[PDB]
Amino acid sequence: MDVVSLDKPFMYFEEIDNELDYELPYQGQLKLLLGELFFLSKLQRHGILDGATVVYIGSAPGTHIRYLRDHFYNLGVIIKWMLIDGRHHDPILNGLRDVTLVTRFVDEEYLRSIKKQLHPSKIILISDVRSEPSTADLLSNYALQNVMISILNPVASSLKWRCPFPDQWIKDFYIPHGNKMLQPFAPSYSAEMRLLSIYTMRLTRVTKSDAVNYEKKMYYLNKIVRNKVVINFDYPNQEYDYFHMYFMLRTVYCNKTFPTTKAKILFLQQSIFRFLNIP
Ligand SMILES: Nc1ncnc2c1c(C#Cc1ccccc1)cn2[C@@H]1O[C@H](CSCC[C@H](N)C(=O)O)[C@@H](O)[C@H]1O
């Protein structure tokens, strides 16, 4: 891995400043855990996580979600979880009174009834639904996620966002405004991000040129940026993904006090890796 010297990683897609012509155990749970710890801890900074209800659609198996609960439960934040998926959840989510497990594939009708029974409580939406996927599949998925936002009307949302490849384009489509969070420990050449929105919902047109820009910026990120060693980085592991994770984990609150920020992040990573059984 070529060495580099960085003050900060690329946190959002917009920050990628170059492009290139495209050519761990249970790492998926770690990717989701970090991204949702980042999202929900940003909402905790804005004082809008407390009292809300996280509706997580496409949450199964959702092993990492148990860490998410326990984290915010141990911080005293009052959160109710509603995990909705047609598949069965990881049994480690069992026996939690503040976590509701729902075995159902959501549609427009069922989103209406969810909203009725949670209204007027704050809803926070995390969607990870998926139906290799074609562009029609992605378009249907993203149409469903817009439907989720229009009906649930969440105070914030984190949406699975991967632009369809330019060589598989079908038509222009619309997604909500928001910041496109980059995911550490994503698969080596994944172009998936999490669309993070805080609602105060305007839709944005996505064009085939955007698809090209995504494909080229993410390839530069995956081929060049993520294969670097951050030599100035003071951490037991200086590979970019750990540098990336480190900056996400410092937005996380914690009840315990540490002599240094590095001490905190190290403890957090130790706690996350241990629970997910990562060496
Ligand atoms: N409507 C829905 N409601 C509930 N769950 C739905 C769906 C749907 C769909 C659809 C659809 C959309 C438009 C038109 C027609 C159909 C998919 N899923 C679930 O998304 C997960 C992806 S992988 C999660 C991984 C997980 N985050 C983990 O912790 O590992 C799977 O578990 C799958 O069962």
Numbering used by the authors: 1 to 23, 34 to 141, 147 to 215, 219 to 297
What does the article say, verbatim?
Monkeypox is a disease with pandemic potential. It is caused by the monkeypox virus (MPXV), a double-stranded DNA virus from the Poxviridae family, that replicates in the cytoplasm and must encode for its own RNA processing machinery including the capping machinery. Here, we present crystal structures of its 2′-O-RNA methyltransferase (MTase) VP39 in complex with the pan-MTase inhibitor sinefungin and a series of inhibitors that were discovered based on it. The structure revealed a mixed α/β fold that resembles the Rossmann fold. The catalytic tetrad (Lys41, Asp138, Lys175, Glu218 for MPXV) is absolutely conserved among these unrelated viruses including the conformation of these residues.
We screened a small in-house library of SAH analogs that contains compounds bearing large aromatic or heterocyclic substituents at this position. We identified several compounds that inhibited the VP39 MTase significantly better than sinefungin. Among them, three (TO1111, TO1116, TO1119) had a relatively small substituent (small aliphatic chain or iodine atom) and five (TO427, TO494, TO500, TO504, TO507) had a large aromatic or heterocyclic substituent. Surprisingly, the efficacy of these compounds was very similar (IC50 = 0.08−0.17 µM) and an order of magnitude better than sinefungin (IC50 = 2.3 µM). To confirm our hypothesis that the inhibitors use the discovered water-filled cavity we performed a crystallographic analysis. We used the same approach as with sinefungin and we were able to obtain well diffracting crystals for five compounds (TO427, TO494, TO500, TO507, TO1119). In each case the electron density for the inhibitor was well visible allowing us to unambiguously model the inhibitor although the electron density for the large 7-deaza substituents was less defined than that for the SAH scaffold of the molecule. The crystallographic analysis revealed that in each case the moiety attached to the 7-deaza position is located within the water cavity. However, the inhibitors bearing bulky substituents at this position caused rearrangement of the majority of the water molecules, suggesting that the bulky moieties disrupted the water network within this cavity. TO1119 that only slightly disrupts the water network has IC50 = 128 nM while all the inhibitors with bulky substituents had a lower IC50 except for the only substituent that is able to form a hydrogen bond, the TO500 that possesses a benzimidazole heterocycle. These results suggest that for optimal inhibitor binding it is probably important to disrupt the water network, but it is not important to replace it with other hydrogen bonds.
